[PDB]
Amino acid sequence: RTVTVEELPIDPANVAAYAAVTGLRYGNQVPLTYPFALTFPSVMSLVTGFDFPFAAMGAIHTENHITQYRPIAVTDAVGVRVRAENLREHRRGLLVDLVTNVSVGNDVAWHQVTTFLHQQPPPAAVLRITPAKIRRYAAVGGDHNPIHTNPIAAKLFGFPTVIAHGMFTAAAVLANIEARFPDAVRYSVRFAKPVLLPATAGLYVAEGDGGWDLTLRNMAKGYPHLTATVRGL
Ligand SMILES: [Mg+2]
Numbered sequence: 320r321t322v323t324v325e326e327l328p329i330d331p332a333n334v335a336a337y338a339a340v341t342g343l344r345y346g347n348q349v350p351l352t353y354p355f356a357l358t359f360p361s362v363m364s365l366v367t368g369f370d371f372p373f374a375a376m377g378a379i380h381t382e383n384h385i386t387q388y389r390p391i392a393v394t395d396a397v398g399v400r401v402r403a404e405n406l407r408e409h410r411r412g413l414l415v416d417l418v419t420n421v422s423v424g425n426d427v428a429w430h431q432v433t434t435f436l437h438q439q440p441p442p443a444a445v446l447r448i449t450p451a452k453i454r455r456y457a458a459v460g461g462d463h464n465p466i467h468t469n470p471i472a473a474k475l476f477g478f479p480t481v482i483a484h485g486m487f488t489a490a491a492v493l494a495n496i497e498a499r500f501p502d503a504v505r506y507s508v509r510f511a512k513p514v515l516l517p518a519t520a521g522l523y524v525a526e527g528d529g530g531w532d533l534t535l536r537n538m539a540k541g542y543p544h545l546t547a548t549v550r551g552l
Pocket residue numbers: 383384385489506507508
């Protein structure tokens with residue numbers, strides 16, 4: 320239950336296209352969330368190879384914790400390690416933790432815990448999220464889970480329309496604030512109601528220190544799509 324890549328190259332053109340579609344800045348270091356996408360093929364090879372029943376197609380992303388110890392340069396080639404751990408019963412199904420460590424040289428730069436489920440007032444910003452943009456996020460980020468792109472498959476897996484990738488939303492909400500993030504930062508997200516597409520969602524931001532609290536809501540109905548914290552280390 321362990322995957323390794325010794326020297327994964329970074330494609331800057333992909334980093335640019337990731338920043339464009341999520342609304343983040345393309346600079347010399349990759350966005351804080353970008354290594355989710357970079358290591359995604361490595362995570363899915365672990366998930367798809369689970370001995371027991373657990374399907375990547377139609378899987379649900381419930382929670383995500385990123386710890387960045389140091390930025391990763393767009394020119395870096397990276398070491399990747401993934402392990403899967405903490406199978407639990409939930410209610411809606413099987414939960415599992417996928418734990419990824421991304422290294423530059425001998426050092427761990429970026430550390431993530433991803434939790435998946437197999438089913439068994441005026442805002443500080445506004446996000447417009449269309450099916451087209453998410454079709455584009457799926458191409459660029461490489462998560463082709465069809466609940467985000469194929470309506471017929473979304474229905475089959477329980478949703479009335481296609482939904483946004485949780486990690487699209489988790490990237491997009493950092494747009495304004497990311498320029499003030501320190502190099503060492505932790506970002507914790509709890510996904511709630513899926514974002515049904517197309518949608519216009521409002522982001523609420525408080526400065527609960529030394530950092531930020533975030534809540535993304537559906538604008539008509541007001542229910543939460545996610546809550547998150549950003550903190551310096
Ligand atoms: Mg996260």
